Amino acid sequence: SELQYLGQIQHILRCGVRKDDRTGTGTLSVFGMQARYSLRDEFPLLTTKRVFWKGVLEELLWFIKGSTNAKELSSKGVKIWDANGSRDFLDSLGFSTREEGDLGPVYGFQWRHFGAEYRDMESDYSGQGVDQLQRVIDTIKTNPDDRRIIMCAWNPRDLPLMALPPCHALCQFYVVNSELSCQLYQRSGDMGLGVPFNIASYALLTYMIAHITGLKPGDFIHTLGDAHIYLNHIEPLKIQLQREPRPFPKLRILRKVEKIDDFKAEDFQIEGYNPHPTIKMEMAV
């Protein structure tokens, strides 16, 4: 099922159109793609290249905790957001009053406190805003046939206060035959760098919510808007494209957890992940 991501890479290289972007780099773009990754007895952690699974696990716990402080995640070993929370990148977009790591109201804030008035990254928002994450878990428990199980991060009101507007803007859940499925709408997909990271992130999120609600993981539908391949990624991706995929690993939950907040990093174990060598690709800031 990894061939779907590879088939999207090969289709952008062969049929994608050249298109400029905000960064000083260049892209080959295709608008509108959809792939289905099965979560049943396998976890879609890519094997054609080693994916930062510790980054995937620590960033999601950072989202669930509602933290918007980049130093909070960077103190765990995952420095993927320090570029968007640095003084050089923040001061270029008019954000001159931030302390250290103030991305603004981003994925963590919108998941737990949607609509609340964002002060800074250290302020308390308990009881403020809409808790989309906990409301989604409550709806799955009480009314699984509901078609409104949605957690949205795209907030036009808080949009100008974010260092980078949300890429995974909207995700919806779906229950049938005790199988929890998840579809993510990604408005902008860095096919070389972020997309493998984002697929594993929301696949893990489905496993956590399926563990709490007592359901089995079903499918993860990855819907893309602007799916692009940066020009400085063509050679590293052509090397990844020649690699033969290996079977997906498995994700094991080591203890029964009742609440979404009680998940710790030690509760997860990836079993049987044998990927090809890492392929470091430059980020476009």
Ligand X SMILES: Nc1nc2[nH]cc(Cc3ccc(C(=O)N[C@H](CCC(=O)O)C(=O)O)cc3)c2c(=O)[nH]1
User: Which residues carry a binding-site annotation?
Assistant: 22, 147-148, 167-168, 187-190, 198, 228-230, 284
Region 218-257 residues binding its own copies, contact defined as CB under 8 A: 236, 239
Helix or strand holding residue 10 (H, E): helix 3-15
| Residue 166 binds ligand X, judged by CB under 6 A | no
CA angle 162, 166, 170 (to 5 degrees): 140
Which candidate, 100, 97, 58, 99, places its Cα nearest to that of 80? 58
Which candidate, 250, 263, 248, 121, places its Cα nearest to that of 205? 263
| Residue 36 binds its own copies, judged by CB under 8 A | no
Q: What residues form the annotated binding site for dUMP?
A: 22, 147-148, 167-168, 187-190, 198, 228-230
Cα separation of the two ends of the chain:
31
CB of 5 to ligand UMP, least distance (A): 13
Q: Phi first, then psi: what are they for 177, rounded to 5°?
A: 55, 40
Which candidate, 178, 222, 233, 218, places its Cα nearest to that of 200? 222
d(CA 85, CA 71): 9
Choose the one of ligand UMP, ligand X, its own copies, none that binds residue 123, judging by a C-beta under 5 to 8 angstroms depending on kind: its own copies
Which candidate, 124, 120, 151, places its Cα nearest to that of 135? 151
| Residue 89 binds ligand X, judged by CB under 6 A | no
**Residue at shortest CB range from ligand UMP:** 194
Choose the one of ligand UMP, ligand X, its own copies, none that binds residue 51, judging by a C-beta under 5 to 8 angstroms depending on kind: ligand X
The reply to whether 171 belongs to the active site is no
The single residue of 15, 152, 167, 171 carrying the catalytic annotation is 167
d(CA 13, CA 271): 33
d(CA 78, CA 54): 8
| Residue 142 binds its own copies, judged by CB under 8 A | no
Which candidate, 181, 249, 247, places its Cα nearest to that of 216? 181
Among 20, 41, 99, 262, binds its own copies (CB under 8 A): 99
**SS3 assignment, position 1:** coil
Angle between the 3-15 and 194-213 helix axes, to the nearest 10 degrees? 150
| Residue 188 binds ligand UMP, judged by CB under 6 A | yes
Which CB, 76 or 135, lies closer to ligand X? 76
- The Cα-based distances of 55 to 79, 171, 188, 222 in angstroms read 9, 20, 20, 20
| Residue 196 binds ligand X, judged by CB under 6 A | yes
Length of the chain: 285
CB of 196 to ligand X, least distance (A): 4
| Residue 104 binds ligand UMP, judged by CB under 6 A | no
| Residue 112 binds its own copies, judged by CB under 8 A | no
Choose the one of ligand X, ligand UMP, its own copies, none that binds residue 211, judging by a C-beta under 5 to 8 angstroms depending on kind: none
Catalytic residues: 167
Q: Which residues bind ligand UMP (CB under 6 A)?
A: 21-22, 164-165, 167-168, 188-190, 194-195, 198, 285
Q: Which residues bind ligand X (CB under 6 A)?
A: 49-52, 55, 80, 84, 164, 190, 193-194, 196-197, 283-285
Q: Which residues bind its own copies (CB under 8 A)?
A: 50, 96-99, 102, 119-120, 122-124, 236, 239, 274, 276-282
